């Protein structure tokens, strides 16, 4: 019995710049109970048969969860660009797995704002697929010395989402889960029903 629900029905989600990954091995993943909810507005799979989702064996299955704005879910897909894809969470061009998202304004929003959720705004190079950057180092823009302190062309790499119930759906919070499947040369730890 595979405990997929705990990551979906989790109390608190992570920030996108520092997403949370959980390995899901030695379990039988019945994905039919995952399609139950109509709550997952954006459910897209990449590289898997439409019906063999529940009838397949995978060596490893990882989960990656975080919170972003509704208009940035389009960036949770292979071959995407933007602040989320280049700087926070990048799927590979050859990604194999599904992506689930759902509106959580009713939970991840506070009267006045819930600024605990952050996103990386600056970065020198783009993020490699499944590479996580949690460097809270001052970003140097051009040739201005920062001395570890903000200033001209010296800005804190992180920034905060301002989630409020009054915001538009494009700026409301959405909870994303990126089930990524792995087929390796080893007995499959994850097999479906």
């Amino acid at each position, epitope marked *: 019995l595979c405990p997929f629900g*705990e*990551v979906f029905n*989790a109390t*608190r*989600f*992570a920030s996108v710049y*520092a997403w*949370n*990954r*959980k*390995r*899901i*091995s030695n379990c039988v993943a019945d994905y039919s109970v995952l399609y139950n909810s109509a709550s997952f507005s954006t459910f897209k799979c990449y590289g898997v048969s439409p019906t063999k989702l529940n009838d397949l064996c995978f060596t490893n299955v*990882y989960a990656d*969860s975080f919170v972003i704005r509704g208009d940035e879910v389009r960036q949770i897909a292979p071959g995407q660009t933007g602040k989320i894809a280049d700087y926070n969470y990048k799927l590979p061009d050859d990604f194999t797995g599904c992506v689930i998202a759902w509106n959580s304004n009713n939970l991840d929003s506070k009267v006045g704002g819930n*600024y*605990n959720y*952050l996103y990386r705004l600056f970065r020198k190079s783009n*993020l*490699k697929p*499944f*590479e*996580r*950057d*949690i*460097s*809270t*180092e*001052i970003y140097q823009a051009g040739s201005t010395p920062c*001395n*570890g*302190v*903000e200033g001209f062309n010296c800005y*804190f790499p*992180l920034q*905060s989402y301002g989630f409020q119930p009054t915001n538009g759906v494009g700026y409301q919070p959405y909870r994303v889960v990126v089930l990524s499947f792995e087929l390796l040369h080893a007995p499959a730890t994850v097999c479906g029903p």
Partner: antibody
Framework: VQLVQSGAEVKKPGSSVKVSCKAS????????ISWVRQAPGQGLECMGRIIPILGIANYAQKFQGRVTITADKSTSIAYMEVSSLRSEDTAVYYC?????????????????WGQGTPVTVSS | SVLTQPPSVSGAPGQRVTISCTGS?????????VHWYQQLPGTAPKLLIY???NRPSGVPDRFSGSRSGTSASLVITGLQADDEADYYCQSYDSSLTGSLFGGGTKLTVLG
């Protein structure tokens, strides 16, 4: 050692206490500030974090309303407070600087630790 | 979940010493790295190894780290009496949505 905390503190059950942290080997620059607790003869437990530059506080679930952490970037000092003290919360409380990196399995590590301030709760 | 450590390990001067840090899929099971700290009695912990295979300038050459799956190992090759201390490992847990320490191990140099 690496960051300077306040002095020792002895408090009665039900009191609240506030401790302070200042910087050695740095200037609080872009460093997240963590609070870790070491009970008597017991392992370490991280209860809180403060982002000085953004002023955003994240606390562990075992943290309740009771612990509240703040920090001033101007002053260069960081602080934490506990209310409704009891026998349980007797420990050396540490303030430490978190460090992040870019990588595939990135996880924060604490490079600088304070002196430790032992808070004892007794009647 | 949590990280598990030997409550105690004993070593003879000059021997190799292996301290373990095992975790479930919530922490070390995913890519999450492990970090080691040396803490002498009464002193504040000090960073010993970050990223497992890296040690800051000032950590002597005999400390190393290795990983293989859901476990992590701190090794002291040329054990010396200056190594009598507590050792904790630290990583991130997804269920906790935060950093996590281990139980610690007291290394008694039997010389």
């Amino acid at each position: 050692v690496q960051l300077v905390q306040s002095g020792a503190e002895v408090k009665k059950p039900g009191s609240s206490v506030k401790v302070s942290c200042k910087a050695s080997g740095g200037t609080f620059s872009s460093y997240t500030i963590s609070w870790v607790r070491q009970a008597p003869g017991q392992g370490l437990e991280c209860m809180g974090r403060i982002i000085p530059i953004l002023g955003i506080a994240n606390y562990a679930q075992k943290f309740q309303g009771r612990v509240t952490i703040t920090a001033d970037k101007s002053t260069s000092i960081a602080y934490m407070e506990v209310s409704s003290l009891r026998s349980e919360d007797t420990a050396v409380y540490y303030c430490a600087t978190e460090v992040g990196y870019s990588g595939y399995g990135s996880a924060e590590y604490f490079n600088h630790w304070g002196q430790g301030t032992p808070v004892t709760v007794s009647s | 979940s949590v990280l598990t450590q030997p409550p105690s390990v004993s070593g003879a001067p000059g021997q190799r010493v292996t301290i373990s840090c095992t975790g479930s899929n919530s922490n070390i099971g995913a890519g999450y790295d492990v970090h080691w700290y040396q803490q002498l009695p009464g002193t504040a912990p000090k960073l010993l190894i970050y990223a497992n295979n890296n040690r800051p300038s000032g950590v002597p050459d005999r400390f190393s780290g290795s990983r293989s799956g859901t476990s992590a190992s701190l090794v002291i090759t040329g054990l010396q009496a200056d190594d009598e201390a507590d050792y904790y490992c630290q990583s991130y847990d997804s269920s906790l949505t935060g950093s996590l320490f281990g139980g610690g191990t007291k290394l008694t140099v039997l010389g």
